[model samples]
Target: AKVNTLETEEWFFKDITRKDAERQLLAPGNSAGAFLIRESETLKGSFSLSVRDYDPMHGDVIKHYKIRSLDNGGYYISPRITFPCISDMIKHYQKQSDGLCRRLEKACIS
Candidate 1:
């Protein structure tokens, strides 16, 4: 799903995929998808070129990519891979969240 704000209006992407769980968020264990968001070349966002085999046990997987402006100008790309344990996975995500938060704070402040 997608959303955007414009002059006196708000826009949303319709449900192209039939299944809500698969449409709104990630699909079940073996499924995968992709999405793109753009602003006439000024800013662009994209995710997953193909199915990512993230979790071997449950088959949860994904890939992500992003582009930003001057303040926090950077990009990231990742492949599905498992961690040693659930605790390790939590810690890894926490770190990712922290980094994004820091970038957001800086972007807002500056």
Candidate 2:
């Protein structure tokens, strides 16, 4: 028999249910400069926090707050933004972090 590495990794992945897919962790609306968070329909106990906005120089954008659930009932978020005009990638991490904090606070409170 052959070993399946993908299947073997199931223990590390979260499991989501269809019922949870319809649930929204944040209010539903698609507006530029606005952010939204929703339960991950594919990853149990996990959520996806996303943002849509426009930069005067870069046009419209959507950034995903790549999140993973921890064993201790917490989350990890990694945010990425790519703009051809961005020369200083390290300059705006605080902006992202602040935005993420706001989203999490809203999600956790309501």
Candidate 3:
């Protein structure tokens, strides 16, 4: 069988899912796993940390964090973000990273 690659650099996380998507950012030795694609639901690009499995030493929990920005030129100012999961903090990030690349793609394409 043939392999699949990310649609385009601009597309970002165009070919990622919540399951594999998590590894792409946190896991190593992965081809497309480390990329952040822009799915229909994703508001911005994102990244993640290690999966917090229920280890007797640790606890039963998982955490994911994504980084992006707002529309304004204020690139880093209060960059948008998302936290996929946490014990008490079930928040998410990346209100900016998603549209950041796609928006730029539109401008450069024309």
Maximum-TM-score candidate: 2
Output the TM-score of candidate 2. 0.40
Q: Write down the lDDT that model 3 would get.
A: 0.30
In model 2, what are the clashing residue pairs, if there are any? 15-44
Better of 2 and 3 by TM-score: 2
Which should have the higher lDDT, number 2 or number 3?
Answer: 2
RMSD (CA, Å), candidate 1 to true, equals 15.7
**lDDT of candidate 1 over 1-110, digit per residue (tens):** 12222212111122222233233335332333222222322223221111123355665533332322222332232224344322233335435543321111110000
Over the stretch 1-110, how does candidate 2's per-residue lDDT look in tens digits?
11211223211212333233223222354334444444456544455545454567775555556555445333445433432211122124324554443321121112
lDDT of 1: 0.27
lDDT of each: 0.27, 0.37, 0.30
- Residue 31 displacement in candidate 3 (angstroms): 9.7
How many clashing residue pairs, candidate 1?
A: 1
What C-alpha lDDT, on a 0 to 100 scale, does residue 26 get in candidate 2? 24
Model 1 is weakest, by summed lDDT over 10 consecutive residues, at: 101-110
Candidate 3 stretches greater than 4 Å from native: 1-11, 23-28, 31-63, 74-110
The list of candidate 1 runs beyond 4 A from truth reads 1-23, 28-30, 38-54, 70-110
**Could you give the C-alpha RMSD of every candidate to the true structure, in order shown?**
15.7, 12.7, 13.7
Model 2: how far residue 101 lies from native, Å: 13
